[PDB]
Design an enzyme around this catalytic site. Structure first.
Site, PDB file in Angstrom:
ATOM      1  N   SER A 632       0.835  -1.220   0.000  1.00 57.66           N
ATOM      2  CA  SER A 632       0.000   0.000   0.000  1.00 57.66           C
ATOM      3  C   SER A 632       0.881   1.287   0.000  1.00 57.66           C
ATOM      4  O   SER A 632       1.600   1.532  -0.972  1.00 57.66           O
ATOM      5  CB  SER A 632      -1.028  -0.110   1.149  1.00 57.66           C
ATOM      6  N   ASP A 710      -8.667  -5.641  -5.705  1.00 61.55           N
ATOM      7  CA  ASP A 710      -8.424  -4.653  -4.647  1.00 61.55           C
ATOM      8  C   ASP A 710      -9.503  -3.565  -4.688  1.00 61.55           C
ATOM      9  O   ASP A 710      -9.559  -2.759  -5.617  1.00 61.55           O
ATOM     10  CB  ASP A 710      -7.011  -4.047  -4.749  1.00 61.55           C
ATOM     11  N   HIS A 742      -6.933  -6.601  -0.744  1.00 61.66           N
ATOM     12  CA  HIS A 742      -5.898  -5.665  -0.272  1.00 61.66           C
ATOM     13  C   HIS A 742      -4.858  -6.439   0.508  1.00 61.66           C
ATOM     14  O   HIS A 742      -3.673  -6.359   0.195  1.00 61.66           O
ATOM     15  CB  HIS A 742      -6.474  -4.523   0.568  1.00 61.66           C
TER      16      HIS A 742
END
EC number: 3.4.14.5
Lengths: 766, 767
Positions: A632, A710, A742
């Site tokens: 991320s 995602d 994710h």
């Protein structure tokens, strides 16, 4: 020459043999007995996460008694448990185990967000197709209250929108009123209107790859419009037989948009204990303003399409009645939403409030506001106001440390003893400890949890017992039970004695360190040492990263579960280094505020400095052979590292990277980066896909991992990066996770993630 | 020891420097009535545009400018109707300076697809707007809708659906009548069209081109096994004033339903009308694709439409009892019908020409005479089928182990004055498309008109006095020469093609074609690019390029340099590049192609292995320990079968756009060759590479997957599902995405990357 340590190379089946070789109690409710046992703790556990309990004696490891689930609702007096198990709804009341009574239904769709009515346990609520539904577990009588729902069915009711769940950590759009007014009765519900018409639609593919369809999210990106919100009442009367005799929809006597202009999101909401006023925290689009406001029930008139019959009701609202702005917070950084707000039980209100914006650190204040009933013509319209004057604002805590209020940290307030229990970092930023202070007298601040460990606690309703879920960097996680005991005439100094225990204990833990920057700011860090070190050898090094807001990697608690792979990295001779740079959480607002309008730029100096300090202190870092890695924000930073610092970072393994801030949402990005119109320079500077020209010419220096499904960081990010890498002529490797969103949830996909990572380092960290 | 050629290891920027360093049609003859005999009209690109040449009475032809991929032409009025940008344009012709195209406005909102000029009246034309048939008038500007199927919204009209466009190579579903009637006791103008109800068809989401917008497009994609769209033929008539105004209009439908009159008719492959206007013909086809048959639909067979089922009986009674549809021709096969679009009808009977591969095994022309005798039908009542006419005679005009080109927009040209039929074929060789002529009256002497030793793409004048041939060879670049049929008028068969004029004229070392025989005694052809500056003795590493699937023939005598420049680039670094036409390929007849029936993936690689082993023995420069397999669509699918069933042969495998799951692919393609998954489950499973992922290599760097993210045809799902199953079986892979590419890599930037990735991957890991 051979001073530097080569990592033992492996076949692919070898590496996945290595990795395959590698492979707590919560939601407590204290209740008293009134026999051998004093209380009974109810909780969730996973020895399959089901409802369990223990028995607390009068005079050692407590056994886990089975009772029969991510959450549940409890009600003290009736003893009612209400939960969303199966794809259905269940309940049970409370020696031997009992199977749950199934709550049968007429509606189609799941029953989301089940809560029991506090004022009357016979009743309870849920969402169904974006509308609010009342029911009765005794009679079985169900009934719809809101009527927003009917692809372009935008209006919804009781639902928290996308950005509200993910970026304001709020998962409901409705709140029960805790009392009834009367052989008829009535029960109210505050709830949130939501028209998602203006909001942009994004398509993401679903779990079922086979049928090649997408879902339709409402995803407001930065600069684009958020959903149109409002608060509302939904009443409904009942007789003594438990019958919903009637209901009503209640809009505010004036529009929410004109009463409360400059309000962009509803962060939190609820009611005062006695049921008198409803309240809500409102935020603005910058998120630099946060007013907490009381809304009296008489301020809500019935909804009708007839404008005459509305003015009838709009005239009968008392002129004295109005909304009351009891509190207001203001900053040049950003108002983080702090959950804590405790109103005490009439021409003034006393409450407690977590407040980080005052001094810079989150601290508890006692605040009294004054409700100057001001006289208003509510049948006529208008616009500005309701900012009450403050009677006093005594500060109960202060210093350069935080009171924990985010992440569902909470306070506990005993009104008899005038003490408030909280959790904070007072002793160290590396350990979450449990404190107590009087709220009359901001006196001495007694701690109850012992140092050396970071604690996660939960107090008993009767402030007699408390649990702590603690752990340290080296030692595994314990869940102990403590009993506050001493003279009642001195409650602030109750000694927490160890009463009972619930949980207990090829891993070598990391050791924590700190250092100072060239600008003289203390940064805490962490290091995994290469296993069976030979002092003299310089080993190759993997710099693990996040370095975005809302997070703290380095702290004194056990890491071996979530970050086992760092130990695996280290067991093969890698040095795993972890640094919390300026921007990271838990060390006040200024520290984190380093990020403001400048993401990407500030975070790597602190990481480069981290490594070099690591390399001088510890004598085992081959700085020619260093790999940056993360997910991320960390994947974003892995690519920034490889752009800004290629001399330092030989390879980069970027997982789920945010490669374009303009495609990311309002809630997160505007908080930190403002609006693309206002902060163009910063948005472009920290978009890694606009600087692909500076990425490596040689291959084997850059690996991209992204989960296809995602929801949060869209595969578009990786896909637009590859798009630009192809235009720039730069090499890249790529791995896709077709069934992952994710986080990588599936063990098989995770084993493959870890094996690839090992191989990539093995072959190309040279 | 050191007699194995090592390719020079270049840096990535070096490899880009090498790849960077590497990098006339639609003819219409019209006569004149001076210096120039004709004017040749065509498309060309010195963007692609309308041009002309001046063919003299008595050398390289100039390309004059008229002012665009597809255009329409009408001889007498000289009308040029075309599509340009997001709008329609036209012009007419003899110019000396170029003329600008006159623009045609619209009241309709949306683009105007599929423009066609009314043959009978050049003032009128037609187009599709929002899946409905429209009609207009160039002179008056007046538009007028004719169908009302459109207003999720699944009924279409004048549209050929997805599977028809991409598997039956038909790109329109409406057909003008060539003549005008004046019936009653106003000038009528008919159009035959296809109604389509694509309600019962699966919606698939495919990513849109604009990646920023993050939205998809719905596609009515019928999987194999699942239902295709439900079709019908229909008559849309209208009338006009002598001033030229669309007075009346009218939708028409068959007196019984289409589905009931013609049970078992899954797809309308082709359709049109006879030249005089009497019957509207149509080629129907079944779901197996083993029962194609030609039918005539006379205009009185179509009644009007109303919602009222009682207005219907009235005019169902009104239609002449004699009139009906006549099933003229019925092709049946145990393999499969390929739609050959050749069907020329002439003026009690009907006499036509028809290409027929199912009869002898090779596509050959025939003269067919059917007999249309009406049985007398009660059209108020319904019934179940029958309509097969008896044949007068079926004379065969060609025969042998070679074929007449009929698919791929090949065609015949029929002079009815001389009784000759001009066609293209493989009579000399399967490696060369040649123009032939024969009489349809007396089937004897087949005269070739094109030069041997090359392969030719041809097009005749409507006056049969001169043709073009766009030709090439394996070595020489492509030419386009204009030939002229010339000789005594009394013997038209032997008119001698004399070279008249030329349109277009001709470090790349061409490949050598060879052939060899398989252990079962079947002749296979193949190519090889030799490594540049070969030193006999050195054993070079070898890239086996491939496709292998049906409808294709890579190996033939014609210039490859354009589309397979990368193969020569490979050769110039020292790679042997080998190409073999396995069994199941195009242009070798039906029995050759039919080696794939129900076992796709199983026979092709065995032929490829033998092709490698032959080339190693024949030529002395192939190191067999270092061989790479690579290809796209079917080729990538095969590249993965090579790595599955022949790991000991193939060191690496670069698979582009592969068909990983047959059950996910469309009906038209898959069912024709593999049957329906309910019948042939053993062969769907056996030739779906994603179900055999456990057999891929445990070593890394042996498998590179390439895929374009916007693939309308072979959906990214396939690579996604492969990667899913590699992950689940614990197998490594490398992977490459083309985010802006559908099925063929179109962008030069994206293609340059594709090739540098290919050179690097081989450079490092082919050992």
């Amino acid at each position: 020459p051979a001073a530097r340590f080569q990592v033992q190379k492996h076949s692919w089946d070898g590496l996945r043999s290595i990795i395959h070789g590698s492979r707590a109690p919560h939601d407590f409710q204290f209740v008293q007995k009134t026999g051998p046992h004093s209380h009974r703790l109810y909780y969730l556990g996973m020895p399959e996460n089901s409802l369990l309990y223990s028995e607390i004696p009068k005079k050692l490891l407590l056994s886990w008694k089975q009772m029969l689930i991510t959450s549940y609702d409890f009600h003290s007096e009736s003893g009612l448990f209400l939960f969303q198990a199966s794809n259905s709804l269940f309940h049970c009341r409370d020696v031997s185990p009992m199977k749950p009574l199934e709550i049968k239904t007429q509606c189609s769709g799941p029953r989301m967000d089940p809560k029991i009515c506090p004022a009357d346990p016979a009743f309870f609520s849920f969402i169904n197709n974006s509308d609010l539904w009342v029911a009765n577990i005794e009679t079985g009588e169900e009934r719809r209250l809101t009527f927003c729902h009917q692809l372009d069915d935008p209006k919804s009711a009781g639902v928290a929108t996308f950005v509200i769940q993910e970026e304001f950590d709020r998962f409901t759009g409705y709140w029960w009123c805790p009392t009834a007014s009367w052989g008829l009765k009535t029960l109210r519900i505050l709830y949130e209107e939501v028209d998602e018409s203006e909001v942009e639609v994004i398509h993401v593919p679903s779990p079922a790859l086979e049928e090649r369809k997408t879902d339709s999210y409402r995803y407001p990106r930065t600069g684009s419009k958020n959903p149109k919100i409002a608060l509302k009442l939904a009443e409904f009367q009942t007789d003594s037989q438990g019958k919903i005799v009637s209901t009503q929809e209640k809009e505010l006597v004036q529009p929410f948009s004109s009463l409360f202009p400059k309000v962009e999101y509803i962060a939190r909401a609820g009611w005062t204990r006695d049921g008198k006023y409803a309240w809500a925290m409102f935020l603005d689009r910058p998120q630099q303003w946060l007013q907490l406001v009381l809304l009296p029930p008489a301020l809500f008139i019935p909804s009708t399409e007839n404008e005459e019959q509305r003015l009838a009701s709009a005239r009968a609202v008392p002129r004295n009645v109005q909304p009351y702005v009891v509190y207001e917070e203001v900053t040049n950084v950003w108002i983080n939403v702090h959950d804590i707000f405790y109103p005490f039980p009439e021409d003034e209100l006393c409450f407690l409030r977590a407040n980080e914006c005052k001094t810079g650190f989150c601290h508890l204040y006692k605040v009294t506001a004054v409700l100057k009933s001001q006289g208003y013509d509510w049948s006529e319209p208008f616009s500005p106001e309701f900012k009450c004057p403050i009677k006093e604002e005594i500060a109960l805590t202060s210093g350069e440390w935080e009171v924990l209020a985010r992440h569902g940290s909470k306070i506990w307030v005993n009104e008899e003893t005038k003490l408030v229990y909280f959790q904070g970092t007072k002793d160290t930023p590396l350990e979450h400890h449990l404190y107590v202070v009087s709220y009359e007298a901001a006196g001495e601040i007694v701690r109850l949890t012992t140092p050396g460990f970071s604690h996660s606690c939960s107090m008993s309703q009767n402030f007699d017992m408390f649990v702590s879920h603690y752990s340290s960097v080296s030692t595994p996680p314990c869940v102990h039970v403590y009993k506050l005991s001493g003279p009642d005439d001195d409650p602030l100094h109750k000694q927490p004695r160890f009463w009972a225990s619930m949980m207990e204990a090829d891993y070598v833990p990391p050791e924590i360190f700190h250092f100072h920057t060239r600008s003289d700011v203390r940064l805490y860090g962490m290091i995994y040492k290469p296993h069976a070190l030979q002092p003299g050898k310089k080993h190759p090094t993997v710099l693990f990263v996040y370095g975005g807001p809302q997070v703290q990697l380095v702290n004194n608690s056990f890491k071996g579960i979530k970050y086992l792979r760092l130990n695996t990295l280290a067991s093969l001779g890698y040095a795993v280094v972890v640094i919390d740079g300026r921007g990271s959480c838990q060390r006040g607002l200024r520290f984190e505020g380093a990020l403001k309008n400048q993401m990407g730029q500030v975070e790597i100096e602190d990481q480069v400095e981290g490594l070099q300090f690591v390399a001088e202190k510890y004598g085992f870092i081959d700085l020619s052979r260093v790999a940056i890695h993360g997910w991320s924000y960390g994947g974003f930073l892995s690519l920034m590292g490889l752009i800004h610092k290629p001399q330092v970072f030989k390879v980069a393994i970027a997982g789920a990277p945010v490669t374009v801030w303009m495609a990311y949402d309002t809630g997160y990005t505007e908080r930190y980066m403002d609006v693309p119109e206002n902060n163009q320079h910063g948005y472009e500077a920290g978009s890694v896909a606009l600087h692909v020209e500076k990425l490596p010419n040689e291959p084997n220096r850059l690996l991209i991992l992204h989960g296809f499904l995602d929801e949060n960081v869209h595969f578009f990010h990786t896909n637009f990066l590859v798009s630009q890498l192809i235009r720039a002529g730069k090499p890249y490797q790529l791995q896709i996770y077709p069934n992952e969103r994710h986080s990588i949830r599936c063990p098989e996909s995770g084993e493959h993630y870890e094996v690839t990572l090992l191989h990539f380092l093995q072959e190309y960290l040279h």
